[PDB]
Symmetry: D2
């Protein structure tokens, strides 16, 4: 009997076998959660990657920028686990920022039309996903989305950082709204995962940080999807090896 | 002499006499500062507003959602202050958020498009004014923005907090760019300024019919008296954010 | 299985059956933990509270201002759990501050001697216990202490608020040390828990913090149930928050994340 | 003229001319304030150090660990500054922590008795000075303290960091009391400076940072003593070149 017995859990973000949405989904099922998976564009590719999970699940199409996808979303999830069954958990593990405002491109050279699409998919779609799903969730349930410490600036991360800071604010409001269903909303701020800054991360981490290992981040999302943190919401747990709390 | 003596400062945001920007300029001039100002929609009416500010200042047009105003800014300023002179300070007192994304209007019924218009103007616009004016700014310069503390969610402000949360991030990134020029970038988290509880939590009280202390603090950031603060946030809130109860 | 199975956890800070430490322990066992308890002063009276847990476990003396108690704690634990065995968890649920620096007493009227007793017991102890129990802990182990968000000033808490701020700083440092041993260090900030006797002002002021907490916490908050705090602590002691240390998890209904 | 013209202000912490208090005093005087100066032990050397200040100034004694120096503080100042008058500003720039609680000595080996003394001098004494000098403080006045960002652990600064976390907590509480007198209390969190015995900082700093130069800090402290940060209390202004706002 693992952490997630009898729990029906939605999981977005699976694109590659190296995705955090993958290791989270794999770990959930490894603990009893019966999963429902969602996918963005390459519907048939990620179908073949989900098949490599310990167990199979009703993968569903979900482009967060498409309004019809959200409207339908809820009722389609009902069809996959059977009507009169609701969701105990949901996982938002999605992000997107065009090269224009993220990476090597100067912070100033990023048009708003590029940034807004970055914030649409990475921040706003947290609320929108909650909106589409709360109605079909059970009390004592959990919504958990991916974060990356944005409280300070850095190279490359540029406007994605600004999207994460948008997310954090969005998390706190979704919590307000989510509380009416007896639902908790939290963010897991992870350390950098392969999918200077990383040689220093593992230094700063008092227990180390292995950027090739996404399992320690998944275990932490399962804890948030479990009943063992029933009094925390609108909040950020940090799975970065303790890096953020260490200057040098 | 004044605190902003012989520093040429740009001040946006003015729309009425209550307006944060209005008091900021007002004090800046009292502090011997030679100003430049920018206005948004009702340009014509806002000249009958800028008239009261002690001295005469060149009211240039600026719309942070308009790409052309931005490209022509440095040229429309450099000329206002005469070729050969650059700015020493920049003030962004600009915010907007459609009604659907605020107040009693549910959080989830805000269409992205409204929220997007709100981020562009309230958060992104800070980076775009910086891009436009860093090239014509002197070393020892200071850029400043108006912030409303978004660390915690609250009633009514809704997506504006999200725009404010985005704005604080952006600010840190503007500070990197401005560093290349020896120019600083900071926000001022103001308490309510009308355009009970706060007066309570605030150990020195708080008066939301009075914008001068907020206005004063924006002047300090423009001064040479905080030469080591950058990509940071100063609270002009009567210390309310520092008290639980 | 149980969430904490075959884990040898040392719990500290049980004085009455309302103690947070009593429910951390009560839950710990429901979830399979094998416990070693530490008690402070009235050592006889607390035996009679520990009896009434899910299961009887060894009570040990630990006056964390006694340097002798620390130098012998590790051997006394090892002895209680059997040679060859080591602790997998430690819980610091200890705190103290005189009426002088906490209550209706003016902030400026707490003589430094009292404050110092409070800081020793409420913050420094965390570094001592950690120092004493770390050499007998398995890699993967966990240390958690109880905290109460000192970020902002408030009425009454006064100098204990300062102790908590020092405790958070001491936590961050302890993490550095326990990491060598493969042990995580974390604190749990809990909303206020039932653990006008003071008077008109206090019975009101404090009646306002419990009116306010429920209000602000988006999933509400119950001043009478320490169970959700006990579950939070069990999740730090578990293998399901292994990437997190020197940090603070907030089991307070999410109230600290809301302004009103 | 000056920023602090004709303001009666006290300043503690001067032991050499490298001291942050010396440059806070120096600039305070370059701006036309009248100063009272306190000194811990080497009174005949802080004497000889202070001669070399823009204007001559009263140097009364004050070991903040002495109940009597504190008990007699208000009256000794009220004499130096003359009867009928009061202070407009107070500068706590005091801090100390035994060898044991810093540097190469292992964080676990500091006896509380050492930790305790350093918290007494660095953190607690701020409430004392506030307590001692507040009945002799005019409305619109201002208390300020020196801080080093203790929000994340680091090596070496060790137990002093715990003292600074405490001092910040103390700062917010001293503001409660200060407001009653119409006064503000604030810390200036400074970047490292070459003091008698006290890199990445100048790198992280968007505007860089020189640790042999304390003038930016004194300018900051003065800006808290001025009338130009009137809305700011219980808070912490960072004079560190934006360092803390960046990660790399
Ligand atoms: N990997 C890291 O180093 C790291 C660290 C901290 C946080 N994060 C965050 O974790 C989350 C997971 O990302 P990842 O690291 O696994 O990268 P990833 O590329 O594997 O996953 C990102 C996902 O976002 C999805 N996506 C993009 N646009 C979408 C849309 N319109 N609708 C639905 N889905 C869309 C992609 O399809 C993809 O599955 C992201 O939010 C990211 O910001 C990643
Ligand atoms: N009033 C407060 O309690 C308070 C508190 C903290 C922060 N602030 C911030 O201070 C700033 C100014 O607010 P205020 O209280 O002076 O109100 P205000 O009405 O006087 O100022 C708002 C300004 O936003 C400008 N604006 C909107 N859209 C624009 C666009 N497309 N292009 C250019 N300008 C545009 C308007 O012209 C106006 O000048 C805002 O950013 C606000 O968030 C206000
Ligand atoms: N009750 C709340 O709302 C609340 C909220 C947040 C945090 N906490 C924290 O939980 C912890 C325990 O609080 P509680 O509510 O269980 O109260 P409690 O009175 O039941 O526990 C305090 C414990 O400290 C122990 N103690 C005192 N002096 C000691 C000494 N020097 N050596 C060893 N132990 C000593 C006592 O024996 C007692 O068990 C404290 O750290 C407190 O700050 C309580
Ligand atoms: N230099 C830095 O890297 C740095 C950075 C941030 C903050 N600070 C802070 O600035 C403040 C002043 O230190 P500094 O950098 O000028 O170095 P410093 O050595 O020149 O100043 C230390 C002062 O503390 C005083 N002091 C010690 N015991 C005292 C006592 N019992 N009573 C009264 N005063 C006592 C000393 O007399 C001395 O004047 C300290 O609080 C320090 O922590 C320093």
């Amino acid at each position: 009997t693992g952490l997630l017995d009898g729990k029906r859990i939605l999981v977005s973000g699976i694109i590659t076998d190296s995705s955090i949405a993958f290791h989270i989904a794999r770990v959930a099922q490894e603990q009893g959660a019966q999963l429902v998976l969602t996918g963005f564009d390459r519907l048939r590719l990620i179908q073949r990657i989900t098949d490599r999970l310990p167990a199979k699940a009703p993968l569903l199409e979900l482009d967060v920028q498409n309004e019809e996808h959200l409207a339908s979303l809820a009722g389609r999830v009902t069809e996959a686990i059977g009507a009169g069954n609701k969701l105990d958990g949901v996982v938002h593990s999605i992000g997107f920022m065009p090269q224009t405002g993220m990476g090597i491109n100067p912070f100033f050279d990023a048009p708003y039309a590029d940034v807004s699409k970055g914030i649409h998919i990475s921040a706003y779609s947290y609320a929108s996903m909650a909106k589409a799903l709360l109605p079909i969730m059970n009390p004592g349930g959990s919504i958990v989305g991916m974060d990356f410490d944005p409280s300070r600036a850095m190279p490359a991360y540029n406007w994605m950082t600004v999207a994460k800071s948008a997310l954090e604010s969005v998390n706190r409001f979704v919590a307000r709204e989510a509380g009416k269903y007896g639902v908790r909303s939290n963010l897991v701020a992870a350390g950098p995962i392969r999918t200077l800054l990383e040689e220093g991360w593992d230094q700063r981490a008092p227990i180390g940080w292995n950027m090739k290992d996404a399992t320690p981040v998944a275990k932490t999302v399962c804890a948030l999807l479990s009943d063992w943190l029933p009094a925390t919401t609108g909040d950020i747990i940090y799975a970065d090896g303790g890096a953020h709390t260490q200057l040098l």
